[PDB]
Design a protein around this nucleic acid. Structure first.
Ligand SMILES: [Mg+2]
Lengths: 64, 135, 189, 32
RNA sequence: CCGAUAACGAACGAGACUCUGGCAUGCUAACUAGUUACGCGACCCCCGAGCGGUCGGCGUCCCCCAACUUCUUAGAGGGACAAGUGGCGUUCAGCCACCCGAGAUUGAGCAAUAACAGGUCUGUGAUGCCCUUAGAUGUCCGGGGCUGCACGCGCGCUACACUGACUGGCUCAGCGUGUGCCUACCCUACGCCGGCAGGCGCGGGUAACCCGUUGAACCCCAUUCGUGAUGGGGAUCGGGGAUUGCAAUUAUUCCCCAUGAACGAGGAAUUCCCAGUAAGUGCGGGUCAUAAGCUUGCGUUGAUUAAGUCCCUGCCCUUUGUACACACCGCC
């Protein structure tokens, strides 16, 4: 029933966020489906072309 | 980052390019050597900053008309402007599109009924003027 | 052909998850005899990912002021702890360290200071580089806390910390802290 | 160096003035 | 800085500049610097090497009786410019990445207009006014004080231990000081005595010549200890011995043997910091007859995190509002 942990690869970096620069928003496409892609805010040093894991499918989508 | 060149180097580079464009070239290590004798530069750092900007500006000049003047580009302009005069004028067209409203004006000036004039059909609809405001 | 600390070839180690393959540096050109190759790894962003992971462990293990420049002692400690983990498990200490890092690195966290909503504020994902950094930091902190006021040696406590993290037994300080962080991130979703 | 210093201002660049040296004539060769 | 332009032409500041660090087996040189090579040696191997291995042992500017400058010293120069390539950008100013390269942001110094009732009259034979000027607020001498303690605060040092302490062995620096106008007081090798602090003789050095090849600490390798207020910590305190000085009591400092107190990582708060940096760790200089828990420098080991933001604290530019202009610690 619960959604399994999946993987998403960063394609683009959408700039910092978090009121202190401590997060960066990145557009990530799921390794399962190349077409399906969302935007998520992540912490730590991120560069385009790296894979990060997701414990949930949807959390957030906004443009600053 | 932090590689902005100031007035002291930019004006000097422009002046020496204007004066010695022929001697100057695309080689940084040769422009730094010609800068030894074409001008008195107190500091080696100043002289090679100037030489680097000179090479950059010459790369720009070889393609386009930079604000720094050059006698070859100036004479090329002075050629293009006074030349490419067409063998036949664009003002000796055999037929001329003339609106009937414009046709009556020549009648008073008794220069109408010329062969080169062709009385057209004026547009009907008066559909000029853009729609007002938004949309 | 390299045999870090004279033994335990590096080429036999396989990285488990795709997310940390580019950031865990154990194989091929990341094959050095010693975890002491000071080479200006902080001069640019994303350069410590090219630093071999044993050297990162060594750098993180010398902390709390009393031993800050003593990197030779830390190299010795890592060498011994590798001997103990090989003795206990029978498998490659580098593989054990890699698996411990994979299992210790948290996958989610919390952030934002918006009046401290529920636990911290709003849940956030973590980058692979921060996963590796926090895993190494948690392992070193767990070993240090385990070996502070007791007879067990730093090498032994580092060994058991890495072993428990690699097997995921939740008997390790790093695993417990990671679980707590994931729990509060879930609450701050 | 009597009425003052000898070194120029460090940011002062003085560019010498060349001559014409155009020479648009036909290629000849002086014999001497 | 590029550009737009009722502005044009300038001046200061920034930058540029000076010193320092990084590279030059390229040049100039070196008995107050060395390296190689050779000759004497000393020790090991000797089966058998022998152009064998070690020597901070002696020599070859003790002038005819070797060369060279890599190491060291320091001068002249060179070298790096966003210069080359790719992308972004008006394709402008520039930005990002990469190659080659020692180096693609090394640190400092200097530093505008205007101002503060900021600090110094206890730096000055800088100084206006005022006070005092012989029972002196001048100056000198003796003694005491500047240290004095129910308490609060700031800069620090040592620690709370086993990533440790003790004992022994081994092993590596760079800054820089050194015999005094007055002015008396230098750095110290070596030998002897003592357990130590020290003492007693002999030198050397006004200095790349002597200390000194600065045998530094940490670190490294072996020993003992075993999670305890314990061999952690060394506060407090007794007794004894030296050194400086005219004088050591309110202990100047140092040495030895005893005492082993709090302290088991510290609340609210809060400081500093981005690469040879923080930190650990010693060594110089200043003060110094005697002296560093201070400061100014130097080396040694040497990281975690970050290449962002305006959230807090502030700063700069523009617009805006103002009843403020002693300028929001305002005004009312
Ligand atoms: Mg003891």
């Amino acid at each position: 029933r619960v959604q399994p942990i999946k993987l998403a690869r960063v394609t683009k970096v959408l700039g910092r966020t978090g009121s202190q620069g401590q997060c960066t928003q990145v557009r990530v496409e799921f390794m399962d489906d190349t077409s399906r892609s969302i935007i998520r805010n992540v912490k730590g040093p991120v560069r385009e072309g790296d894979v990060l894991t997701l414990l949930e499918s949807e959390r957030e989508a906004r443009r600053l | 980052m932090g590689r902005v060149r100031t007035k002291t180097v930019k004006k000097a580079a422009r002046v020496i390019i204007e004066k010695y464009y022929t001697r100057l070239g695309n080689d940084f290590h040769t422009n730094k050597r010609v800068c030894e004798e074409i001008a008195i530069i107190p500091s080696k750092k100043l002289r090679n900053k100037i030489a680097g900007y000179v090479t950059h500006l010459m790369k720009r000049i070889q393609r386009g008309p930079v604000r720094g003047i050059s006698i070859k580009l100036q004479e090329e302009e002075r050629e293009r402007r006074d030349n490419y005069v067409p063998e036949v004028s664009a003002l000796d067209q055999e037929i001329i599109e003339v609106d009937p409203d414009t046709k009556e004006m020549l009648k008073l000036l008794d220069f109408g009924s010329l062969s080169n004039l062709q009385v057209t059909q004026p547009t009907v609809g008066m559909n000029f003027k853009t729609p007002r405001g938004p949309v | 052909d390299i045999k870090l600390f004279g033994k335990w070839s590096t080429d036999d180690v396989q990285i488990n998850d795709i997310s940390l393959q580019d950031y865990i540096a154990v194989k091929e050109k990341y094959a050095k005899y010693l975890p002491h190759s000071a080479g200006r790894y902080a001069a640019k962003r994303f350069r410590k990912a090219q630093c071999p992971i044993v050297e990162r462990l060594t750098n993180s293990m010398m902390m709390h002021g009393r031993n800050n420049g003593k990197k030779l002692m830390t190299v010795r400690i890592v060498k011994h702890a590798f001997e103990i983990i090989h003795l206990l498990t029978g498998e490659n200490p580098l593989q054990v360290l890699v698996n411990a890092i994979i299992n210790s690195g948290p996958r989610e966290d919390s952030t934002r200071i918006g009046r401290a909503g529920t636990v911290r504020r709003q849940a956030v994902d973590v980058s692979p580089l921060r996963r590796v950094n926090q895993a190494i930091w948690l392992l070193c902190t767990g070993a240090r806390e385990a070996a502070f006021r007791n007879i067990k040696t730093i090498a032994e406590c580092l060994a058991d910390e890495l072993i428990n993290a690699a097997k995921g037994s939740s008997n390790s300080y790093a695993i417990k802290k990671k679980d707590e962080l994931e729990r509060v991130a879930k609450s701050n979703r | 160096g009597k009425i003052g210093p000898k070194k120029p201002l460090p940011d002062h660049v003085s560019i010498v003035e060349p001559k014409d040296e155009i020479l648009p004539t036909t290629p000849i060769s002086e014999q001497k």
